[PDB]
Amino acid sequence: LEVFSQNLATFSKTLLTASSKVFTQSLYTADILSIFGEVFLPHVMQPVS
Amino acid sequence: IKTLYNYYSEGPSTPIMPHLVNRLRGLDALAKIDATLTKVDMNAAYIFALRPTFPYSYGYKQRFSNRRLTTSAVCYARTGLSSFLTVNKTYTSNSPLKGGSRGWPIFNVGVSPHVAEPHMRTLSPIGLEVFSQNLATFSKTLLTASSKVFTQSLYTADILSIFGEVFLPHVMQPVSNYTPILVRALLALIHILGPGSGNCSLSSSIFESSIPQFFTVSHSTNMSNRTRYCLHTWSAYKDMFRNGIPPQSTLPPTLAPEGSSARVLIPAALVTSPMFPWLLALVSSGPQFFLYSKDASINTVDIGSRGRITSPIPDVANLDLHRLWNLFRFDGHRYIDVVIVGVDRDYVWPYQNGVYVHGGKGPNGTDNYGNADVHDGIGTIFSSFNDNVNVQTSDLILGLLTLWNHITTTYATEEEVTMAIKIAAAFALVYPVQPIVYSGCPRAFQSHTSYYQPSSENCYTTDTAEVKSTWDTVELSVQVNNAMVLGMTLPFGQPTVSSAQWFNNIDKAEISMFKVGNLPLQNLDYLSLDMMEFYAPTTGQLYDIRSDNLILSAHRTVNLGIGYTALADFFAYLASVPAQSFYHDRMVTSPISKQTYSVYERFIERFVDDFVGWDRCDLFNLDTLLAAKRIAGVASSPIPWHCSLQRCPLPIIMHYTGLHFGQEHITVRDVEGLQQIVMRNDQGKIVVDALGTAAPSRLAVKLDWSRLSAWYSDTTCAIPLSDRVMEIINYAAIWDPTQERRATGFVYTYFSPNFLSSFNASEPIFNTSINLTPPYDDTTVIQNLSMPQMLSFDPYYESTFYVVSADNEWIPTSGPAWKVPYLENVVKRSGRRLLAELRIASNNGSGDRTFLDDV
Amino acid sequence: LEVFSQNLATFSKTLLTASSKVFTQSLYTADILSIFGEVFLPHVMQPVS
Amino acid sequence: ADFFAYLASVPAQSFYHDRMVTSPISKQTYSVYERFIERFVDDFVGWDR
Amino acid sequence: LEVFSQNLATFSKTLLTASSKVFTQSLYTADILSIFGEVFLPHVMQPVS
Amino acid sequence: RTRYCLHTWSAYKDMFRNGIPPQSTLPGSSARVLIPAALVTSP
Amino acid sequence: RTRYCLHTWSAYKDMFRNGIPPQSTLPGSSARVLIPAALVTSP
Amino acid sequence: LWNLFRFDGHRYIDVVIVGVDRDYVWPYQNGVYVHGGKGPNGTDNYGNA
Structure with missing residues (x-):
C-alpha cells in the first residue's frame, strides 16, 4: 500500500509509512520499495493473481 | 454537434466575420473528432494528418447539347508545398535545371515583445514546504516533506535550498505558461514532415510521392541561426557566483522572458531522455541545422497533364529536397x-565525445572540470545532430513525440494547446507564386483595348512526357528564379525578403531587418520547476491518446492554416486586393498597393482578434510587403488587375466559407436588366452598339450572397489546353466606362493541368501504380477553379462596369453561351458516373426515367 | 480490460517509480504496461473489428 | 442485370469486343444501365457501387 | 501586477531563503523580483503616465 | 505473389529498440499478424 | 544636438554592479529608453 | 519652419534595446556599433559605448 501511495501521489516523507531499517537485508527496506515501484508497477496498480 | 452536411448546406450571412469565425471554429471542432489517426498505419496517419484532402464534384454545362456524355466524379484539392527542390550544393556549371531552384526563401520570425499570460498552478508537497520556509520564521515543524531516504533525489534539503534561493518568485506566485514551446514543437513536426499537397518545387508538375523516411543533417555556419550553450553541474554553477557577479549572469529569476542569457535546471535522470535535445530546441533560435531528404530520386515524382506518373525526374543527380524546416x-x-542537478564531479556528458561539463569529469581522467566552455550550435553537442548524419524518421521524431506527450499531459492545460495550434497555423504552410492566364479580348473590341492578346504569368511546369499546356511559358532563368522566389506567401499572404543560396561550394544568406512575424519566448524557469516536480501535475494520466496527441494537434493546425489561407483569399475578394500586389514588383508597378494593403490588413486584424486571440502584428505585417525590391530584367505580363489573391482552389474556399457555385446559379431561360452600350468615333459612326449587364456591387452581394454565385458562371469559362482561345471571348467582354480604353477580358488565376491531375488520387501517394487519368476520358480543358472577377478594380473607388456581348445574336440575360463550370463540395467520396445531357422534346423516353422514378 | 483500466489510471510521475519512464524513456515503453499492452494500446483504447 | 438491360434497352452488342468502334450508342446505353445497376446496388447490397 | 503583488507580499526574512537578500545584499537586488521588476519597482508601485 | 517473413516473438521483439511499433512501418513488413503457437498447427 | 549612447540589455546590465539603477544617474545617461528588438525596426 | x-x-x-544577441547590427547607419553587439571587424560583443 505504501508503494501504491508512492506511485499515486507526489513524494512526501509522510508517504513512507511501512518501510524500516531495523531488520537488515530483509523485504522491508527502501530498495525493495524501489524494486516494487520499478519492475512491478502494473501489479501495484492492479493487484491480481 | 454540426456535421459536414450541415456546413455544406448553409451559405454566408450578411455579417461575414461573425459567420466565418463561427464556421472555422466548428470546422476545428469537427477536426478534433475525426479518428483515423491512432489505429491506422504510421505513414498513413501522418499523411492524413498533414496532407488533408478536400473532396469536390466538378462539371460544366453547354447551351445546345445533343446526346452529350459527361463524367460526374469526385476530386480532392489539397494545397501547400510539402518541401522545396533546389540545386545541390556542388552543382556549378551555371545552367538551369528542370525544377531546381537556385535558392529558397527564408521566412524569418522574430521575438514577440508580448509575453504569454501564465495561469495559476499549485505547489507539490515539497513546494508547499518551501512556501512555509519563505513565509514563516524557521521551525523544525516546518520541514514536513523533505527526506533523506532516497539519495541524490529531488526531495532532500539542498533541493529545498535551491528552490528557496533561485526560484523565490515562483514559490510566492506559482504560475506557468507553455504555448511557445508547443508552437515550436508543432512547427518543427510540420516543417520536418511537410504539409500540403505534395508539390515540392516551383514547378506544379513535380510532387513528393510520400512522407520521407530518411533525413540527412547538414551544417552551415554562414546561414544557421545558432545559439550558445554552456554546461554546468549545480555545484559549479553556484560556485561561479561567489566572488561577485560575472558578466552575462543568469542567476536572477525571470518573470518576463528576455532573448539572451537564459538558463534551465535539468535533473540528471532526465538528461538521458530522448526528449532532451528537442527540449533544448524549440526554445533556442533555429534552424541550427538543415534537414534534407536522403534520396531525392525515390521520393520525388513527376505528374503529366493527362496523369502520367514518371518516377525519376530528369535531373535527380543535381537536386536536393529541402524540408520546410x-x-x-x-x-x-x-x-x-x-545546469544539471543531482550530479557528482565525474558526470561525463552522455551525448557528444569531447564535451565536458563544468564541474564534471575533465578531459583526461581529471575530476571537477574548471572550464565553462561555450558551444556554438546544438550540433556541437547532441551527437544525433552532427554533420552528415543519416536519421530514420522514427528515430528523429520520437523525442518530439515524447516531449509533446509530457507537457500536454503533466505541465500544460488544454487552453495552452489550443492557443499554440491557432498561433502555429499562421506559419504552417508555404505557397508558391500565384499563376494567372489572361484570356484576351474579342476581335470585335480589338480597337478599344489596351490588353488585347492573351497572356500568362507565373505558369511553370517541367513535365515533358505529355503535352505541355500553352499557358505554361516560363523558363527558369536566374532573374525569373529570383522573381518567383520573392513570390511565395504564408497563409495570411505575407511574403519574405530573406533568402539563402548554397551552390558551387558557397553558402550565403541574406536576412533582412524585416520579419514575417514574431513568436513569444518560453520562460525556462517554468520548464525547470516542472521538471523537478516543484509544481503539482495538471493530470495524472500517462498518455495523450484520448486527449490532444501530437499527430491530432498537428492535423488541427494544418487544417487551421489551410482555413486561414482560404479566408485570406476570401478577404482578398472582399477588399478588391489584386494578385499582382503580392508579386516581386508590387512596390513599383502601382502606388495603389498600399491602399489595397490598408483594407486587407483591416480584414486580417479583425479576423485575428476575433478568432486567434493573439496580437495581430505578431502574425501578419506589411513590413515584408512594403520592402519589395524587384529583381531587374523581369517584366510584368500585360494582364489587367482583375483577380484576387487565390492561393487554394475554389472548392477549398467554398468549404471554409460556404460559397455555393452549383448549377442552380447558371441561367438557361429568361425583365429588363439589360443596357445598350453605344460608342461613336470622330466621324459619328456607332462602333459598339452592344447589349450588356451591369456587374453587381459589393453592397448587393452583402444583401444577397446569391448575386456572387450568379456573378460566377457568368464570367467563368473552362481553360483550354492546346490553344490560347477561350469560348468566353467569342461572346463576352468586360466594359469599364471609367477606363480610357473601356474593353478588357478575364484574368482567371490558373493552377496547372498536372496539379489537378494530382487531385485524382484520394490520398497524396503517387509512385507508379496510381491512376491519375481523368475519369471516363473520351477526348482539352484545364478546369476553372479561379474565383470570379473582382466586383471593383479600385480598393477605394466604387464604379460600375458591365459584361457586354460581342457577337450580335447572344443576349446576356439569356444565360452564358459557353462551357460554364459549376462546383459542389460533397462529403461522401463516390465513384464515376456517366451522365447524358439531352434536349427535351416531349418524346424523351429512357428506362431510368420511366421505371426508376419512385425515389 | 486490465490494460485499458491501467493506462487510464491516474499516476503521479516522480522519478522514484516507473511511471516516469514515459518521460525519461521513449513514450513507447513497456515498463508500465506489458509489451503486448504497449503494442495493442491504440486498439485497446478503441476496440473495433 | 439482364432484366435491367431489357428495361434500359441495352443491346447485346454493347458487350462484345467491338463495343467502342461500332457506334457511340453503346455509351449512351451504358448511361442508363449504370443508373439501373447503381439503384439496385444502393438498395440491396449496401456497399459502394 | 505579478511584480506588484510580489513586493507587497509578506515574507519572513531568514537567511535560509532569498528574501534575506535585501539585507545581506544591497536593497537593489533582483533575486526576489526580476531584474525588470527591480528596475521598474517605483513605477510599479505608482503606475502613472 | 506476396512476400512473407517468418520470425518468433522473442526474435521479432529484438529487431527494434526493445519493443515492436504499434503501427507497422513501410517496407516484408507492410502487414503483421500475431499467431499463438497452438493455432499455427491448425489446418 | 543631443548625445546618444547605444547598448544592448545584457551589455547595459554589466555596466553597473549587477543591475541597472531605478533612477538614472547624472552624466550620455541623463535619460534612458528601453526598446524591444521588435520595435526598433519600425519607421 | 523646421x-x-x-x-x-x-x-x-x-x-538600450532589450532582447537582442551579441551579433546585433545597427540597421540605420553603417559604421555605427552597438555596445555589446557586432564589432567593427566582424567582431562580437563590442566593448565600447
Missing part, C-alpha cells in the same frame, strides 16, 4: 546555461 |  528562421534564446 | 524653431529636450539619451 530549412525555409523558416526562428529567434529564441541565444545563450542557455544547462 | 529651421525657424529651437526646442530644449533631453541632452543625453541611452538607447
